[PDB]
Design a protein around this ligand. Structure first.
Ligand SMILES: [Zn+2]
Length: 295
């Protein structure tokens, strides 16, 4: 009756190695990068919030909001400095997605992350929907100019605590991220519309599936499409307070959703192992990590 012969990682792996499974969509968030040293905590530290008193954040979460950024960009850039990763070394999970690409299985990775690690791990623009943008590029905010700045330039401005200004026109230079309160890129919707007609497996990793419309992507999968969540905790289930498309891992009616609870790296390693890809993944990670360490 169902595509997965059992609702387990082993069932998913067997399905992936069947003719049924050609196209995998990954949906990822911050949990895929915590083992890269990027914590899934994005609020200012207490010290930072207190340091920002003079910018009169109307509420502490205003630092994520575009309206507030347009009034005072400095809190955001101070937060960016505090949160700036010390290194950009993608995780086992990222490289697992690279293997999906290498093996012709990756239809798309929809990421909420802004840390650029998917790109470093070798997912290309075509493979990616950076649903909430990225720090990979920044732009002058003036439509008349739109000068593009690489992350190296933005990094230098962030760490020097210099509000980044465009060299051509002295406008603010904003990382290409989607602030809270901003609309998602057209690419998100265009790709969603096409990709979810084609998906054979949804692999959801490292996200609490709280932010919309990203979280609603799970409901865009065809009813038959297996959905594997690799995450520290179950996410994406229906909200019992509302009374769609929620994950059903555990009811009597469950037929296609699998939760593997633990570290994304460990889940991807376990899945890779079941697929016969563990050595390939280990070798890829080790060489890429070595290369990044040697930068
Ligand atoms: Zn400019």
């Amino acid at each position: 009756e169902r595509l997965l012969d059992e609702l387990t990682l082993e069932g998913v792996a067997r399905y992936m190695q069947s003719e049924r499974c050609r196209r995998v969509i990954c949906l990822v968030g911050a949990g895929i990068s915590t083992s890269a040293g990027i914590p899934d905590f994005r609020s200012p530290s207490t010290g930072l919030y207190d340091n920002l008193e003079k910018y009169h954040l109307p509420y502490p979460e205003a630092i994520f909001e575009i309206s507030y950024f347009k009034k005072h960009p400095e809190p955001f850039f101070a937060l960016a400095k505090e949160l700036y990763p010390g290194q950009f070394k993608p995780t086992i999970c990222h490289y697992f997605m690279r293997l999906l690409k290498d093996k012709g299985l990756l239809l798309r990775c929809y990421t909420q992350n802004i840390d650029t690690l998917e790109r470093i791990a070798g997912l290309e623009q075509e493979d990616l929907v950076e649903a909430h943008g990225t720090f990979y590029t920044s732009h002058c905010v003036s439509a008349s100019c739109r000068h593009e700045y690489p992350l190296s330039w933005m990094k230098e401005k962030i760490f020097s605590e210099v509000t980044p200004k465009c060299e051509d026109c002295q406008s603010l230079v904003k990382p290409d991220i989607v602030f809270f309160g901003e609309s998602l890129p057209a690419r998100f919707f265009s790709c969603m519309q096409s990709d979810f007609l084609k998906v054979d497996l949804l692999l959801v990793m490292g996200t609490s599936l709280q932010v919309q419309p990203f979280a609603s992507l799970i409901s865009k999968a065809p009813l038959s499409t297996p959905r594997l969540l690799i995450n520290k905790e179950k996410a994406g289930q229906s909200d019992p307070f509302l009374g769609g498309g929620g994950m059903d891992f555990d009811s009597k009616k469950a037929y296609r959703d699998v939760a593997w609870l633990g570290e994304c790296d460990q889940g991807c390693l376990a899945l890779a192992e079941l697929l016969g890809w563990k050595k390939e993944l280990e070798d890829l990670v080790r060489r890429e990590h070595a290369s990044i360490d040697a930068q």
